[PDB]
Symmetry: D2
Subunit: 240 residues, 4 copies
């Protein structure tokens, strides 16, 4: 029965021994749900957020599961210096980086006629520029090693959808899809694949459970998506 | 790590443990056969189908040699509705149930429109698009009659989207498959069935895809990791925007 | 106000002197609406349809506008022999062909689970294969003359939309989109451009809060037939579903 | 031969009695080429750019056609104050505003690993944020009157294309496409349609074996500004990459 919220599946070893860094991972949300999935799949995890108290509580909750290593690094993704320090501390604490999941993003609800420059710029900075910062810091690191890796960006159906009062967030998210495509071509040189998931915001008569989005992230992080780069996977809007 | 090097096929990770997976056009070494192998590596019992009767039996025996799940073979000309209907029934009789269908069967060509023959046009469409409808109808009829659901994976093509000289028949057919995936997916929710497609490219890494890589993505779409997805088409890999 | 049905605009000489052939053009429908638009734009027109008596009446109604010349040729588009004769008789009656508009489509509402092959094949034949037949016959004509031309295909939003009980029409129309792309690349060699319009259709929700007037769809067909679309080939123009 | 550059076509009266504002329209390039097309089609035009002398020169050249009125207003599109005053000045000098064409854009060639925040932000500001500023200013005007109008953005195939070293420009142009879709929905209220053209560019490549002449891109913009696109809003028209 597809209309009933399904139970989160077990791990299947998809990421065993990989170090996975996930942003916007404080408290309930796709970020923490993705960190948990990575742990379920046998990974060591580094979680990051601007919000220090809830990041710490999230780290403790993940550690309690008694799976692999869990580290937390504070990072304001609007700061280049902090995003560069995020990658450096990740490698310091966990020995390497294998997978980056770029979740950080900021929504809103404002028609173009009422749009302020301050909100427009903030949404782009948090939702789109942050992905660039973290991809830049990650690729610099991957260029310097031989084992390569994977990045997974989290876009949104709003990148495709015509939606009243969502022009900021939609433009930032369409921006993320294009950045995913173009950085993927560049990333081949460093042995890195880059793809994105695009969550819907419904065919089953229900919304996705967070775990279902994280499960598709895990696929794009895993060797099951070996040949895919520069792709954007709708979860789930029947994207044509 | 060097992405232009052909990677080694990965081990199974239990993604389809206990499921019955039927794979069409699966005689040989091609994508059908490879996908059947992936299904077995993932813990599935498998039924393979094809019209190459001897080649199929031989493929079945080789897949049986792995000593994993059960392998059954069922002959089917996918241009015959009676044969496709009988494929689903025999699969269900032999293996006990059907959980996942993979629609591989397709037919290529190279002919400009200006000199296209009706015969070639009709055959490409029949093998490539109409077979997928035949197999999907028969499976949804089965699924309708039981309480469990399941999953169908279609195999489309980047040619559905790409403007390509001399491919109008195959491109139209594969674009047809994408649309059929979408519409049948909305209908299939009722029976607890998800329907998606993979879309192979024909190069960012400077190498072609290994058939095993396409099969790995099919396995994803057959598995619970794709739990929320239905009526999607996943490019493997053309950077589809 | 955008939610009110707008009045049809005047002609602007976008097709002055061109021979435009339009299929599924008898009676009331996008075909006859497209033929009228062609005439408003200065064209001579050949209209085609299955139903002989209805086609003659539309031919008379159109010639009465007192604009370009209007000819009619009967064609069952499921017949290769008849589509081949449509182009032949078009050139015989009007002297040449400049623009072909492929309108023919057959709708349905049947789930896959209960789909009959009879309906499936019929829908594919009328909606997709006829477009291949007509494009083949046109390109064959263009290969034999010292000029090119333009084809405009009529697809549908259903090519993209996931819709219960429309898998046949949807497959056929997505098929028309891919045919439009591939045939366009080939048609370059003949100096022929090929594009498609993709009209929205109610599922039974629209940006303006109204359906399109047929004239609005024909006006976009006119654009794709005209020199305004000079650089475009192999495109599919949504009218109008905010296609991303 | 479609590989031979076609001659710019005559006006056909598609914009009679309209005031058309075009940005980045000084000198050579799509803006000035678009302003010329607006004039050929019977519009009065206001052209805008940052370069005062080059803008004045263009104004005099377009005025020397002896067609519609040409005004010029200097505007730095990275400045909200200047963009707001661009719209005000347009309405003051020309009487009203009917069509805005958002042409400004800025590119680069920089791999992500080498990307500076400053270049990233500059490219997004000029290519994407400027379109928001201009659209916000125009919609404020249209809201305050009981007539509608039309906005046309100019995106790029780069919104869709995976291209080494263009991640900033690509993100910006993909963003323009999404902004076009969402602003189109809101604009219905004010009687305004908003669509975009998306010009192709050679990867190395193009169907015709030639790049588009600027006029051909302007001719499609004219269609999007005209009543021939009556039913379209929130659409992105590829000129011409065979967008599926
Ligand atoms: Na051939």
């Amino acid at each position: 029965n597809l209309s009933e919220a399904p139970k989160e599946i077990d791990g299947h070893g998809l990421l065993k021994g990989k170090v996975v860094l996930v942003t916007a991972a404080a408290g309930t949300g796709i970020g923490s749900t993705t960190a948990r999935r990575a742990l379920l799949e046998g990974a060591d995890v580094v979680i990051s957020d601007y919000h220090e108290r809830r990041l710490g509580e999230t780290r403790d909750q993940l550690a309690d599961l008694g799976l692999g290593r869990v580290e937390a690094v504070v990072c304001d993704v609007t700061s280049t210096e902090a995003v560069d320090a995020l990658i450096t501390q990740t490698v310091e604490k966990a020995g390497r980086l294998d997978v980056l999941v770029n979740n950080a993003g900021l929504g809103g609800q404002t028609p173009v006629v009422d749009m302020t420059d301050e909100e427009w710029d903030r949404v782009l900075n948090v939702t789109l520029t942050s992905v660039m910062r973290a991809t830049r810091a990650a690729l610099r690191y991957f260029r310097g090693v031989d084992h390569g890796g994977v990045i997974v960006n989290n876009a949104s159906v709003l990148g495709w959808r015509a939606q009243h009062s969502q022009s900021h967030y939609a433009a930032a998210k369409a921006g993320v899809m294009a950045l995913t495509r173009c950085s993927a071509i560049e990333a081949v040189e460093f042995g890195v694949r880059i793809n994105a998931v695009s969550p819907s915001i419904e065919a089953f008569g229900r919304a996705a459970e967070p775990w279902e989005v994280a499960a598709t992230i895990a696929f794009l992080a895993s060797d099951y998506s070996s040949y895919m780069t520069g792709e954007v996977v709708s979860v789930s809007s029947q994207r044509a």
